[PDB]
Design a protein around this ligand. Structure first.
Ligand SMILES: CCC1=C(C)/C(=C/C2=NC(=C\c3[nH]c(/C=C4\NC(=O)[C@H](C)[C@H]4CC)c(C)c3CCC(=O)O)/C(CCC(=O)O)=C2C)NC1=O
Ligand SMILES: CCC1=C(C)/C(=C/C2=NC(=C\c3[nH]c(/C=C4\NC(=O)[C@H](C)[C@H]4CC)c(C)c3CCC(=O)O)/C(CCC(=O)O)=C2C)NC1=O
Ligand SMILES: CCC1=C(C)/C(=C/C2=NC(=C\c3[nH]c(/C=C4\NC(=O)[C@H](C)[C@H]4CC)c(C)c3CCC(=O)O)/C(CCC(=O)O)=C2C)NC1=O
Ligand SMILES: CCC1=C(C)/C(=C/C2=NC(=C\c3[nH]c(/C=C4\NC(=O)[C@H](C)[C@H]4CC)c(C)c3CCC(=O)O)/C(CCC(=O)O)=C2C)NC1=O
Ligand SMILES: CCC1=C(C)/C(=C/C2=NC(=C\c3[nH]c(/C=C4\NC(=O)[C@H](C)[C@H]4CC)c(C)c3CCC(=O)O)/C(CCC(=O)O)=C2C)NC1=O
Ligand SMILES: CCC1=C(C)/C(=C/C2=NC(=C\c3[nH]c(/C=C4\NC(=O)[C@H](C)[C@H]4CC)c(C)c3CCC(=O)O)/C(CCC(=O)O)=C2C)NC1=O
Ligand SMILES: CCC1=C(C)/C(=C/C2=NC(=C\c3[nH]c(/C=C4\NC(=O)[C@H](C)[C@H]4CC)c(C)c3CCC(=O)O)/C(CCC(=O)O)=C2C)NC1=O
Ligand SMILES: CCC1=C(C)/C(=C/C2=NC(=C\c3[nH]c(/C=C4\NC(=O)[C@H](C)[C@H]4CC)c(C)c3CCC(=O)O)/C(CCC(=O)O)=C2C)NC1=O
Ligand SMILES: CCC1=C(C)/C(=C/C2=NC(=C\c3[nH]c(/C=C4\NC(=O)[C@H](C)[C@H]4CC)c(C)c3CCC(=O)O)/C(CCC(=O)O)=C2C)NC1=O
Ligand SMILES: CCC1=C(C)/C(=C/C2=NC(=C\c3[nH]c(/C=C4\NC(=O)[C@H](C)[C@H]4CC)c(C)c3CCC(=O)O)/C(CCC(=O)O)=C2C)NC1=O
Ligand SMILES: CCC1=C(C)/C(=C/C2=NC(=C\c3[nH]c(/C=C4\NC(=O)[C@H](C)[C@H]4CC)c(C)c3CCC(=O)O)/C(CCC(=O)O)=C2C)NC1=O
Ligand SMILES: CCC1=C(C)/C(=C/C2=NC(=C\c3[nH]c(/C=C4\NC(=O)[C@H](C)[C@H]4CC)c(C)c3CCC(=O)O)/C(CCC(=O)O)=C2C)NC1=O
Ligand SMILES: CCC1=C(C)/C(=C/C2=NC(=C\c3[nH]c(/C=C4\NC(=O)[C@H](C)[C@H]4CC)c(C)c3CCC(=O)O)/C(CCC(=O)O)=C2C)NC1=O
Lengths: 162, 284, 172, 172, 172, 172, 173, 172
């Protein structure tokens, strides 16, 4: 699965050669680069419960019909709202997973793989989840270069949504 | 594999020259190109006159169509679909298409996952294209190179679990792919997802012992117990076909017996008394 | 292909919880001890071709029938066959030290290697006498006191030799 | 790939006799009831996508750990994996009702499916709880009459449900 | 060895909940449909020896080289070998109808049978041509209208034939 | 692919000595007898198509169910297919007499042929009744006294029949 | 399994299902006629059975001298007695093959799984067949020598006595 | 691949309007005459092999140097080359009458055929002397008064002969 340490391996393995300095340069970046990525993981893990209920009530604001229309897909009764905090709470897990991995791999393999297939069948509009993730990237309270770090992977999930 | 080539039957494929259509064709080489495509892509099934694909051989003589775009025309035909596609399971198709066109065994699980997603949204028409329009095909086969058996060789980093599986795909020179002794079911679907690689049984006939494929509930490959031997010196044994009173005394043949070093002298005499033949003897 | 970074994700996905703070303090030591790992790998790959023949001065001198007429390392293609994949042990052990976990080692050198080595007719146990001779030369180079600032290589060093011992266990 | 028309040929070839007159009176009833099946088949394929999610509204609600963290339908490509091939049951059951004989069903859904379903780690028995939930919705649509001339369809329906029961037997 | 009664316990243990009321209404139909199952088994076992030879009047007449010199049913202990275990199919299919679930069938006739049948050299596909000929005679005896009070045994007839189809799938 | 010339090299390489003078006197007789061998191959290949049907005038007349409805030589591609395979016996036996050693015969007709012949369902023993009928016609053709200067090639003739007996042993 | 010259010409004759032809019985009549020579000849191998094995072990170890030197697989004393324990088992089954007259009893015991153990143990497999050839050089030297025995051609037996050793060397190397 | 049904869609898509009622009255006429089109095609394909040689009794008798030594139809694979694709004219003309529009004809026989026929060296004009001889025999068969209900086939016949004239124009 996609990781800068893995991407050095799978490039050098398909050539059948050893690890050159060009694969070994790349390993260095995660080490230097990561130090600021693990700063972004603790910023989201500690503020996790504020961010989920901060998000699942922000999507109810912009889409008030989602709590009113009686549908299995729609979050009309409590069972949808129970599956609301499950789904949005699944997003902050995988975002924090792809932070400490350094790559988009866990985001690519757990979340966005086959997302167009599932949202068409269950009629879940992807405009809902992109509205929650814009709330997360503006309200995580992160600062510095770590604020850039979570902001890529959130926005990477946004582009895969649309 | 100089020494093991005879046992493998890989002696024909070892020093076999690639067929290699020239930029200017001649009739003696073109029919020799079509024969070696027909053997490898169709797994040596006999082709009669109605099966000869007389129109697609017609295109080849002109030189307009290269070898690689000829192989897609024989794979997309109903002829190749009548033999393989309509009976076989869909995982059985994937190990065939890797064997027919790329010439090797499916080594990783991700290749079976990825190829089923392609067949579903786009079709088996577009699935044959994914083998041919791939980098593993273009690197080892040019546009004018007839595909061959690349499985026996090291193949630039191919997993050595893949090397065992190629002998489980085909059983020798005289076999075809509709004619193996397991028929319609898939052969490398269990070993691929379990990530265990069973015994390289040699092909038949020159080997006295051939009837051992990986059973459903086999005892584990590496033991952990002492196995009642004063010291840890345990060798795994695989027998093919045990003849005895077959209902009460030997209810299941082709099973492993896990005997340590001290009684291995005794154990091989016990197996041979029933008449079963040993396949493999693996330490543990 | 797994890692130290990705394997502590993959079991954490199977239990479905957020990553704990003591797992992140564990990975913070991996980043901290990360620079040392790169240095060790660099010295192995720069002395990669020098290890293999110096192991082949003893892999064949200790069991001298192998080269002698009759052994499976006798003829010249056969001899170049156990240098074409003596280095593939080093090609994947260096991938294991780079990744930091032996899960990329066990798909290539440990998966079906013990099956071919009774199908071909080669002595399987005569490999692991010399992979140990590689480990005796690999950790001798990776430990060097010349040209490198002093640092603790004790943790990086021991579990480098664990990858060779896994490389010898699944062949013998 | 066999049929009702071709299977009564294939056993008649194995005995090597001409086709009897009561076999042709049997096939004349097959042609006679042929029009209804096309009508029956078209209703399944037009409600094909509506069946699968409505079965997935109970396949996962009844065994709720499957999508909860840890189950094999948990992550998103794993979830799209049991919609990728929940429909392939419907893709080949509709081929079986079209052909009129289950010999095209047993090469694709019944042949090696029980082998992969212990190789992957998926619960095999948790499929056939929901293929029965497909059959409860498939024969509810195929029987329901709206804007269609009425004739007894009892014979076609019972052995439509026999194809689902064969589809559940070789997985469980 | 599992049942209908015990398998609806065993998945209910894995989820760790009390048994629901609609599972008990399901089992109440099993007790209600229970008497019919006993009757079906009784008629099979009383005509057990009559089925096997009447299947052997066609298993060998249709593929006549098997008996002829060279085939694997040629000599006399070889012939008594495919009557020794033609009945073991009936010995475990009748155990499956008694238990009501095929989980006792798949450990004895379906587990390692396809492995021995290429180790011995017997045609595996030439078994499942005649196990189908057993099913044609088993459900004919089972459906008899003589000596038994009329009742609907349709569930048993179709899923009695599902046990033979599972018995033919893992051999062929 | 081995020879008489190359096999007496290959064991002489395995012992690693120079070729002895009585091995060269052995090969000098092989060159001396070389002309006789060439004549035999030419005679066989010129009557190659005449042998196969004249063997097929007895391979099917002696076991007449094979082409009768039900046998595996019944339909027309099954008839043609068997004939194509039958000659390939002559295609590789003539390669064996040319090379002078059966090591090229055992990779093609003897290697996996007994495995396919139980996978397909063809009678394996019904091949070696007619390969013997080829040998009865092959050594009859070789023995002809017309158009060839007389010499004693009886030694060459007997071990021509040994190649057919090896060709019949690994199929039956 | 155990087959013969008498029983193998039955077993293929059963598979074709015909009566035994007269030229097969004239073939077996020569086997009975040439039968007496085999017994006398085979008695000479078993009477010099222990003398062959050590005289092969004066060259099996002298030609490849690291094998008994420290490190080789014939080094220690039970390891040395291990390749005399089963150097004779080659002679135990080759003499069974000449008695039966067909190598079908040889291929179940020395040729069946022997090449599998010989890479599982770690012993050199090719270093066996250098000395089984040295047994054949001493076996046909004893079986041919005519000492106090009436002289008749023994050529058919000798050539195919050495064929059993060559089959015994092929499946180990 | 286009049709009569699909080409009146494809220009109607390019103008982006709904299909007019007089286009549907045009397509209704085709359905009425649909049976006639099917009948004509069946007759041609049943006499397909009889047309080609009867055209080859005049294609070569009229220009007799072609099979005489020197001509491009001289040797035997060259002769079988102009029967392997004399029928491909009939293979695609019958596809054109089935589709009812020559748009499937012009991709296979008319697209690059005039380019190969000067690259090979074959006379291009000596094809269209005999494709006219096919048309003289094709419309003679498709116009029979026996065994078919009588209706004028002229509307069909003249534009059957238009497909042969298009088949002769792009070769000559
Ligand atoms: C680990 C990453 C991961 C996520 C996030 C995920 C989401 C996911 N949410 C689903 C359904 C659902 N998703 C929602 C959520 C919503 N619908 C609404 O009305 C609200 C607008 C919104 C929440 C804010 C609801 C209510 C369902 C049930 C819909 C149905 O059953 O048809 C489904 C299909 C059925 C299921 O198993 O429950 C998936 C696969 N799956 C994953 O593997
Ligand atoms: C005692 C010292 C000794 C060694 C080590 C040795 C190796 C050796 N490995 C060989 C082949 C091989 N070697 C490998 C091993 C590998 N290929 C892969 O794909 C993997 C990357 C890699 C293992 C990690 C394989 C799969 C073959 C068979 C290749 C073939 O048959 O073409 C061969 C040629 C054929 C043979 O006899 O089996 C030799 C001589 N020989 C020796 O005498
Ligand atoms: C005067 C009467 C006359 C005709 C008609 C004729 C045809 C003819 N076409 C030939 C080849 C050919 N014919 C075709 C034509 C076709 N193949 C296809 O793929 C299409 C289906 C089809 C056209 C619709 C092609 C492409 C070749 C070249 C094939 C090759 O070179 O192998 C050849 C052999 C090689 C040659 O000289 O070019 C002959 C003799 N010869 C004659 O003397
Ligand atoms: C309850 C699970 C179970 C089964 C099923 C079983 C079957 C079974 N059948 C056997 C043999 C055999 N089975 C057959 C069967 C047949 N050959 C034909 O040609 C016929 C078509 C067919 C019968 C219809 C034959 C012929 C043998 C003897 C094979 C031999 O002697 O090589 C053997 C070993 C040989 C023996 O001891 O007789 C077993 C284990 N054992 C078990 O524990
Ligand atoms: C892939 C290319 C590459 C290499 C080769 C590399 C090596 C490398 N080794 C370093 C440190 C170091 N490397 C060592 C290694 C050792 N000291 C000992 O006394 C031991 C014997 C030995 C380990 C066995 C030590 C002790 C340090 C101290 C600094 C640190 O902890 O990183 C550093 C820290 C930053 C710097 O030196 O500027 C670098 C750059 N960095 C790269 O980007
Ligand atoms: C054309 C006929 C055909 C079918 C039907 C088929 C199924 C099939 N499903 C698979 C996995 C799977 N199957 C499922 C489906 C399920 N698991 C669950 O949790 C649910 C209970 C259930 C769906 C209702 C899932 C989630 C996977 C992925 C499991 C894994 O990756 O380990 C796999 C192995 C991996 C793969 O390529 O994706 C196969 C071969 N293959 C075939 O060729
Ligand atoms: C391939 C395109 C195609 C379809 C779809 C088709 C269907 C079709 N179904 C028909 C009849 C019918 N179809 C049904 C079907 C049923 N009635 C019930 O109450 C049951 C629940 C159900 C079966 C499960 C019945 C009862 C009839 C009455 C007429 C007849 O027997 O054909 C007929 C007779 C002619 C007509 O209706 O004009 C047509 C056309 N014909 C076609 O050409
Ligand atoms: C031809 C299709 C057909 C079948 C199969 C059939 C069976 C059948 N068995 C019945 C009863 C029964 N069947 C049994 C049989 C047995 N109980 C035991 O404990 C014994 C072990 C076993 C006999 C060996 C018993 C005890 C009853 C009780 C009711 C009665 O006397 O009929 C009844 C009574 C009515 C009902 O159950 O609804 C039916 C229907 N009826 C049919 O129409
Ligand atoms: C040169 C090396 C070589 C050999 C030997 C070879 C044999 C061979 N014979 C085959 C089939 C076959 N072989 C036979 C032979 C016979 N059936 C009978 O009943 C008769 C007694 C007998 C002829 C006398 C038949 C009938 C088939 C076709 C079986 C079928 O289509 O079901 C097949 C399976 C593929 C196919 O049939 O297309 C192979 C590979 N192929 C090779 O490449
Ligand atoms: C009926 C039993 C019988 C056979 C088989 C036989 C063959 C035979 N072929 C001979 C010669 C020969 N045979 C050939 C044959 C050929 N050389 C080639 O390069 C060609 C490819 C091939 C012909 C196609 C040749 C060239 C000679 C040279 C001597 C001569 O002219 O007779 C001779 C001359 C005397 C001798 O060799 O001792 C014999 C005996 N004689 C017999 O009594
Ligand atoms: C009846 C058929 C049959 C045979 C032949 C057989 C052989 C056999 N040889 C063994 C060991 C052995 N065999 C040898 C043989 C040799 N060492 C050399 O260097 C020489 C080339 C060669 C002697 C000529 C050695 C050294 C061992 C023990 C190796 C060890 O334990 O490390 C063992 C291990 C345990 C035990 O002996 O009890 C068996 C079972 N078993 C059988 O059932
Ligand atoms: C050096 C090559 C050579 C051999 C091998 C040889 C053996 C040999 N053994 C013979 C006889 C015989 N050999 C035996 C031997 C035995 N019968 C038994 O039942 C006993 C078990 C066994 C002795 C232990 C017997 C009984 C005869 C009877 C004839 C006679 O007294 O010579 C004869 C008499 C002539 C003949 O058979 O044609 C020959 C040739 N002669 C040779 O020139
Ligand atoms: C010689 C010039 C000529 C032609 C070509 C001709 C054909 C022709 N085919 C007809 C009918 C027909 N033709 C067919 C033919 C078929 N339907 C199918 O579905 C089958 C696939 C196919 C046969 C294989 C059928 C079914 C009819 C129905 C009317 C009838 O029975 O004649 C009729 C009846 C009268 C009419 O259509 O106006 C005509 C005219 N009549 C002529 O004068």
């Amino acid at each position: 699965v996609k990781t800068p340490i893995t991407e050095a391996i799978a490039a050098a393995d398909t050539q059948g050669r050893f690890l050159g300095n060009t694969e070994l340069q790349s390993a260095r970046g995660r080490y230097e680069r990561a130090a600021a990525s693990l700063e972004a993981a603790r910023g989201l893990t500690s503020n996790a419960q504020r961010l989920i209920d901060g998000a699942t009530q922000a999507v109810y604001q912009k889409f008030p019909y989602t709590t009113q229309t009686p549908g299995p897909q729609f979050a009309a009764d409590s069972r949808g709202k129970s599956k609301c905090a499950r789904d949005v709470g699944h997003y902050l897990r995988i975002i924090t997973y792809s932070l400490v991995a350094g790559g988009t791999g866990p985001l690519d393999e757990y979340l966005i793989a086959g997302l167009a297939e599932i949202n068409s069948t269950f009629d879940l509009s992807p405009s809902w989840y992109v509205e929650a993730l814009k709330h997360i990237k503006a309200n995580h309270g992160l600062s510095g270069q770590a604020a850039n770090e979570a902001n890529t992977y959130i926005d990477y999930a946004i582009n895969a949504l649309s | 594999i100089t020494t093991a080539a005879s046992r493998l039957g890989t002696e024909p494929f070892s020093d076999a020259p690639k067929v290699e259509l020239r930029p200017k064709a001649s009739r003696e080489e073109v029919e020799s190109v079509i024969r070696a495509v027909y053997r490898h892509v169709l797994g040596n099934d006999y082709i009669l006159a109605s099966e000869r694909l007389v129109s697609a051989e017609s295109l080849l003589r002109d030189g307009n169509l290269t070898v690689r775009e000829f192989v897609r025309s024989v794979a997309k035909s109903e002829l190749y679909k009548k033999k393989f596609f309509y009976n076989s399971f869909q995982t059985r198709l994937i190990e065939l298409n890797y064997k027919h066109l790329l010439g090797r065994a499916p080594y990783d699980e991700s290749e079976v996952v990825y190829h089923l997603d392609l067949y579903q949204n786009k079709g088996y028409d577009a699935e044959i294209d994914s083998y041919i329009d791939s980098w593993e095909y273009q690197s080892n086969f040019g546009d004018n190179v007839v595909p061959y058996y690349r499985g026996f060789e090291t193949q630039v980093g191919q997993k050595t679990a893949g090397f065992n599986r190629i002998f489980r795909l085909y059983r020798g020179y005289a076999n075809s792919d509709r004619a193996q002794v397991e028929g319609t079911k898939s052969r490398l679907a269990r070993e691929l997802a379990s990530n265990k690689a069973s015994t390289i049984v040699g092909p038949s006939g020159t080997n006295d012992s051939w009837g051992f494929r990986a059973s459903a509930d086999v005892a584990p490959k590496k033991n952990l117990g002492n196995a009642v031997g004063e010291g840890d010196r345990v060798y795994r044994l695989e027998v093919t076909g045990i003849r005895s009173p077959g209902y009460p005394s030997v209810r299941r043949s082709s099973t492993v017996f896990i005997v340590p070093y001290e009684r291995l002298s005794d154990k091989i005499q016990q197996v041979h008394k029933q008449g079963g033949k040993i396949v493999s003897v693996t330490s543990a | 292909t797994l890692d130290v970074f990705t394997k502590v994700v993959s079991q954490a996905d199977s239990r479905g919880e957020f990553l704990s703070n003591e797992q992140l303090d564990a990975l913070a030591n991996v980043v901290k001890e990360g620079n040392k790992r790169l240095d060790v790998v660099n010295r192995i790959t720069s002395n990669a071709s020098a290890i293999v023949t110096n192991a082949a001065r003893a892999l064949f001198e200790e069991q001298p029938q192998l080269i002698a007429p009759g052994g499976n390392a006798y003829t010249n293609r056969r001899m170049a066959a156990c240098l074409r994949d003596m280095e593939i042990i080093l090609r994947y052990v260096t991938y294991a030290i780079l990744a930091g976990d032996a899960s990329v080692l066990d798909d290539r050198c440990l998966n079906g290697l013990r099956e071919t080595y009774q199908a071909l007719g080669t002595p399987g146990s005569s490999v692991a006498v010399g992979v140990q001779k590689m480990k005796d030369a690999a950790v001798g180079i990776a430990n060097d006191p010349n040209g490198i600032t002093k640092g603790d290589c004790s943790q990086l060093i021991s579990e480098v030799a664990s990858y060779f011992d896994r490389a010898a266990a699944a062949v013998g």
